[PDB]
Design a protein around this nucleic acid. Structure first.
Ligand SMILES: [Zn+2]
Ligand SMILES: [Zn+2]
Lengths: 50, 67, 148, 151, 241, 115, 62, 82, 260
RNA sequence: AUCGAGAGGA
């Protein structure tokens, strides 16, 4: 659940959402974020310099 | 090096049984039979005799320093 | 006289889930006079019990026949008349939980008292009327005696 | 070699003051091999100590008021349980609810939640070990353990 | 808890006459039923709890209720119950408005950043926001009345103990927190040993900024249908690889 | 280098008394007996014989440290009794039991040899 | 061969080195223990400034 | 800084307590008058602890703020946590 | 409130060991008697060696220690002799020590065995046990041509609480409740355990049924002697020593009470 | 006593 999408239903509990994720072998964060149908709020990186 | 006087665990004398044990061994007795003959009922004393190596005989080969 | 609960129980099962301990066995007993339910840990090494045995349980807040509060201290050199002399198996413990089916509005129709005799647990459940004398953090005695 | 150094070491670096680490908000000390195995065996439901045994054990209790507790079994022979002695060992009126290493996952769901058939579900109330068998998960360096609650 | 669970567990009721009679004593239930100021204050308390619940939802996006806070309020409640011989089967003499004003006064007493100027006031509010939210949630009038059944003296002792414990938990000037952090981070290292670099190599890779990470990676999340269906997501994968 | 002498475990140091009587304050009619250069050999028998007494509420012994050579015996008696008297009676009874056992052992030895 | 008799060693104002007036090295030379960087580190975390001064200045090389 | 107001915490810190106890113990061991009635105590550490518990320590703590100012606190004016 | 009334029953009495059963006594008393058997029975042992000459392969410590381990006849002279601590004489005297002398030179080609027969004592009643008028003599050292041993030894009085050489027992077998009636030992699988020498049970049964109102009685003994004392003398002297220690404790207690 | 090397212990 730490990597899923956690939402709040109309009733008001936490419901994890099963959605696809993509893990890359490289780092191009600006270009990846500037892509269609890619979440720019949750997409991150593990290269601190970038 | 030499046979201890007493068993470490119980303190029974075993320092007067090495020569008799060797004689029994040369008399075709099994090691356990010799231990029973010498009245070594406890396995501590049986260890004390069965596991003993006698380095005093090897040390006696070298000549004395003082004549 | 210091007696909270007194009834005759019939043993219906003994370690129904398995003998978890060597010298202690759980008892599942039911009564007939008050229709109670009992689960008791007994030292079967010194007090052996079997299926179908019938005894009387006497839960008391004091071991003296006359009403006198107990200090909860070992005083073997005591000659005062005690009701322990009329029983075969007595255990000293404290009540650690009382549970009922009460709602936010209605009262409790049934009750369940939990006692710990130094780790030997006991749950007595049934009607709320006959368990009214039990209070949490209070010391009680078991006072069991088999009958034929 | 100096009085101020001795005083500051006493007031800061004493072992009792060093029980809980700021690294992980938990005790750094606990119960170790022999005492841990012995307390696991001692706090079992089927441990019964005779009069002489109880007195001999009480001779080794520093914070003892001198009053022998009422035995958990009075007849047909006076007997004290290990949980009673450890209850009297426990200091103050600390409250604690823990779990033993053999506690089943379905015990808290079905019946006998508060009356454990396996003597799990350690409960200490008013400094008294009401029930349960103690282990690392109750006398060790884990957060929320008995020693942590005591500190 | 859900919205319905939150309301049921934390909204003090003053319409169920029988429930109130069971919960509290006769004079207290009569006063609560009669006085409308009491009801208005309790409504405001529930509104504050709802705002705190929303703030908590914001602060913790995931439903992780585990927090590290100074005072074990549940343990102190248990200690108060044991000390004051509270009977959980009888109505209590504790007034819910006494509870509410007690929580407000205790919140005023627990200070981290002192002063009266707005900057310091907001700093103190931010510094104690989590503990105050937890304290209000635990010391709810409904909880203290129907679940904890505390008495007036028990509540007073609880407030005093909370204040003393928080003042004890406040950090001490002169503490070498830098050395503390360095040692507390270096100790695990001695015990710690697709594919992602982990352990001491990654810890070193972090401390000395590495221009060239050993295993650089991107965790890409999808926005629209792509996240649900597979064809569009593999299409995005082709677009990115 | 710091090996204690062999005879230190039983030889009394000069100026050091064999026994010492201290009174327990936590409970009434209780006393602490501290015996130097003694061990479980005397502690266990004294404790058991004190446990025989029906007017001894408590009787226990301990060795505070196996490296040290002292024992502590705690006796708590009835309000009409004294821990000193309980200790004295226990010692006297142990003396009598040992004398009886020794005489009976000598008799049995004589019978076994003489047939 | 590990006999404690060859591992015990205590120092109280013994010989000092010649390049720096600090205690010698090795029990064979009656030298003291080294209060190293990690030890000063832990004392820093403690906050025992007077003890740190005593160890590194007063008891080492005043 | 006016004595009417102070921004530091009113509680003595562990470091302040340790240093005050050590300094007062050294002063006592150097023949200073005692502010408590010594029943039978003869060791400076417990004498200083008794003085601290009596809140009769003749020492003023100069808490240096980072800005460069300082606030002077008496030992009797500080709450003792332990 | 009074003492027990114990009874003895000797099953086997030889020149090496004694077998007896003590009935109607406490476990504390039985274990104390056993402990005194081991550690609080005064016997005579060598504790002072002055090696004039030693050309053997064993060093002087080695030789002395081996000589000290040699037991000596202590049956009757142990009571007359007093500890050198309490003796008012000089370092040694006839009333607190026993003289010894060894003088062996190996001049023949055959290896010379220095046994306990070479130990010559001033006291006729204090001799090595193997030299008493079978078992051979204890080997002290072996000597080849040229090697020679010359030493003087003194035999003092002490108990096993000081050194193991003053211990007069070659094993004190102790057992109570041969059938596990009291459940002192919990056998996870009782059938795996052999019956005791004193067990009274059939082969189909492993241990006696549980006895809830029983305490340890009928303590069994097997006191093997190292030759310093006869086993009967060992038991008698241990009982007397325990009685004496209790008596000194009683005297000290009376003095302390009078001081209050 | 200094340097260097080697062998080791936790
Ligand atoms: Zn042996
Ligand atoms: Zn003499």
């Amino acid at each position: 659940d730490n990597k899923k999408k956690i939402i709040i239903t109309e009733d008001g509990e936490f419901k994890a959402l099963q959605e696809w994720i993509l893990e890359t072998d490289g780092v191009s964060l600006m270009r990846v974020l500037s892509e269609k149908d890619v979440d720019p709020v949750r997409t991150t990186s593990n290269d601190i310099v970038e | 090096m030499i046979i201890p006087v007493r068993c470490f665990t119980c303190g029974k004398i075993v320092g007067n049984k090495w020569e008799a044990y060797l004689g029994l061994l040369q008399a075709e007795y099994t090691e356990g039979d010799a231990l029973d003959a010498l009245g070594l009922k406890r396995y501590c004393c049986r260890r004390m005799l069965l596991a003993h190596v006698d380095l005093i005989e090897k040390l006696l080969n070298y000549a004395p320093l003082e004549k | 006289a210091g007696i909270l609960f007194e009834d005759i129980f019939d043993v219906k099962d003994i370690d129904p889930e398995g003998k978890k301990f060597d010298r202690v066995s759980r008892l599942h007993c039911e009564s007939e006079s008050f229709k109670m339910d009992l689960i008791l840990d007994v030292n079967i090494q010194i007090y052996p019990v079997d299926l179908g045995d019938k005894f009387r349980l006497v839960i008391a807040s004091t071991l003296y026949e006359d009403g006198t509060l107990d200090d909860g201290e070992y005083n073997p050199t005591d000659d005062r008349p005690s009701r322990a002399d009329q029983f075969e198996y007595v255990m000293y413990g404290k009540v650690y939980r009382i549970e009922g089916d009460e709602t936010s509005t209605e009262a409790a129709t049934r009750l369940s008292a939990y006692v710990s005799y130094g780790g030997l647990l006991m749950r007595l459940q049934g009607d709320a009327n006959n368990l009214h004398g039990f209070e949490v953090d209070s010391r009680v005695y078991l006072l069991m005696k088999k009958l034929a | 070699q100096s009085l101020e150094t001795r005083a500051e070491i006493q007031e800061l670096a004493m072992v009792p003051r060093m029980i809980v680490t700021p690294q992980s908000n938990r005790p750094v000390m606990g119960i170790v091999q022999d005492t841990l195995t012995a307390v696991r065996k001692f706090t079992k439901r089927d441990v019964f100590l005779e009069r002489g045994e109880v007195m001999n054990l009480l001779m080794f209790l520093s914070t003892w008021d001198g009053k022998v507790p009422q035995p958990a079994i009075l007849k047909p022979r006076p007997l004290w349980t290990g949980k009673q002695i450890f209850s009297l060992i426990i200091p103050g009126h600390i409250n604690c609810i823990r779990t033993h290493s053999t506690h089943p996952d379905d015990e808290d769901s079905g019946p006998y939640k508060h009356i454990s058939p396996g003597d799990t579900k350690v409960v200490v109330e008013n400094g008294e070990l009401i029930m349960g068998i103690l282990c690392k998960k109750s006398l060790g360096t884990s957060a929320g353990s008995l020693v942590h609650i005591s500190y | 808890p859900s919205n319905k669970a939150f309301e049921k567990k934390f909204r003090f009721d003053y319409t169920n006459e029988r429930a109130l009679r069971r919960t509290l004593q006769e004079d207290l239930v009569k006063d609560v039923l009669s006085n409308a100021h009491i009801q208005n204050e309790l409504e405001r308390e529930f509104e504050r709890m709802r705002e705190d619940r929303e703030v908590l939802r914001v602060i913790f996006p995931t439903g992780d209720s585990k927090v590290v806070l100074p005072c074990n309020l549940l343990r102190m409640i248990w200690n108060a119950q044991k000390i004051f011989h509270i009977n959980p089967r009888l109505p209590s003499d504790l007034h819910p408005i006494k509870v509410v004003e007690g929580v407000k006064e205790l919140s005023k007493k627990l200070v981290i950043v002192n002063g009266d100027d707005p900057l310091s006031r907001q700093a103190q509010e931010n510094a104690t926001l989590l503990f105050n939210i937890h304290l209000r949630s635990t010391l709810c009038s409904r909880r203290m009345a129907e679940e904890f059944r505390l008495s007036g003296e028990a509540f007073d002792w609880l407030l005093g103990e909370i204040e003393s414990k928080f003042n004890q938990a406040i950090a001490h000037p002169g503490e070498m927190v830098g050395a503390l952090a360095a040692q507390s981070l270096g100790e695990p290292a001695t015990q710690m040993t697709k594919n992602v670099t982990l352990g001491v190599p990654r810890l070193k890779e972090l401390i000395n900024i590495s221009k060239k990470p050993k295993t650089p990676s991107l965790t890409v999340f999808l926005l629209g249908q792509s996240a649900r269906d597979a064809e569009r997501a593999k299409d995005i994968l082709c677009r990115l690889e | 280098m710091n090996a204690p002498p062999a005879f230190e475990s039983f030889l009394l140091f000069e100026g050091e008394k064999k026994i010492t009587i201290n009174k327990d304050t936590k409970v009434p009619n209780a006393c602490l007996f501290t015996i130097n250069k003694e061990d479980h050999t005397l502690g266990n028998i004294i404790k058991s014989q004190l446990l025989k007494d029906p007017q001894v509420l408590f009787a226990g012994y301990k060795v505070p440290h196996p490296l040290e050579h002292k024992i502590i015996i705690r006796v708590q008696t009835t309000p009409d009794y004294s821990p000193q008297e309980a200790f004295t009676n226990a010692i006297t009874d142990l003396i009598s039991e040992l004398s009886l056992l020794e005489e009976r052992f000598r008799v049995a030895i004589k019978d076994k040899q003489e047939g | 061969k590990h006999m404690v008799d060859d591992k015990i060693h205590s120092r109280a104002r013994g010989p000092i080195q010649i390049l720096n007036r600090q205690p010698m090295e090795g029990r064979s030379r009656d030298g003291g223990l080294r209060f190293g960087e990690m030890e000063r580190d832990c004392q820093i975390a403690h906050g025992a400034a007077q003890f740190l001064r005593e160890r590194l200045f007063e008891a080492s090389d005043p | 800084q006016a004595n009417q107001k102070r921004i530091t915490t009113p509680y003595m810190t562990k470091y302040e307590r340790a240093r005050v106890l050590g300094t007062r113990a050294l002063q006592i061991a150097m023949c200073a008058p005692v502010m408590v009635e010594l029943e039978g105590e003869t060791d400076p550490l417990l004498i200083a602890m008794k003085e601290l518990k009596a809140r009769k320590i003749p020492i003023i703590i100069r808490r240096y703020l980072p800005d460069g100012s300082y606030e002077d606190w008496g030992v009797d004016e500080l709450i003792i946590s332990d | 409130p009074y003492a027990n009334q114990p009874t003895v029953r000797i099953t086997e009495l030889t020149d090496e060991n004694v077998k007896f059963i003590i009935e109607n006594t406490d476990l504390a008393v039985a274990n104390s008697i056993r402990r005194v058997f081991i550690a609080e029975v005064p016997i005579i042992a060598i504790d002072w060696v002055q090696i004039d000459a030693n050309s053997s392969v064993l060093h002087d410590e080695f030789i002395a220690h081996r000589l000290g381990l040699i037991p000596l006849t202590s049956d009757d002279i142990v009571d007359k002799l007093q500890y050198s601590r309490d003796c008012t004489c000089e370092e040694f005297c006839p009333e607190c020590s026993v003289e010894f002398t060894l003088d062996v030179r190996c001049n023949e080609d055959q290896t010379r065995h220095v046994t306990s027969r070479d130990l010559i004592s001033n006291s006729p009643r204090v001799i090595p046990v193997t030299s008493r008028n079978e078992q051979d003599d204890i080997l002290i050292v072996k000597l080849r041509k040229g090697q020679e041993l010359r030493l003087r030894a003194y035999a003092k009085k002490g108990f096993g609480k000081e050194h193991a050489k003053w211990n007069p027992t070659a094993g004190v077998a102790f057992e109570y409740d041969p059938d596990n009636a009291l459940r002192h030992t919990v056998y996870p699988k009782p059938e795996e355990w052999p019956k005791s020498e004193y067990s009274e049970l059939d082969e189909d049964e492993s241990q006696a049924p549980y006895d809830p109102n029983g305490k340890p009685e009928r303590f069994y003994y097997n006191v093997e002697s190292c030759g310093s004392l006869r086993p009967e003398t060992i038991v008698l002297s241990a009982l007397s020593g325990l009685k004496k220690k209790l008596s000194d404790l009683q005297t000290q207690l009376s003095h302390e009470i009078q001081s209050d």
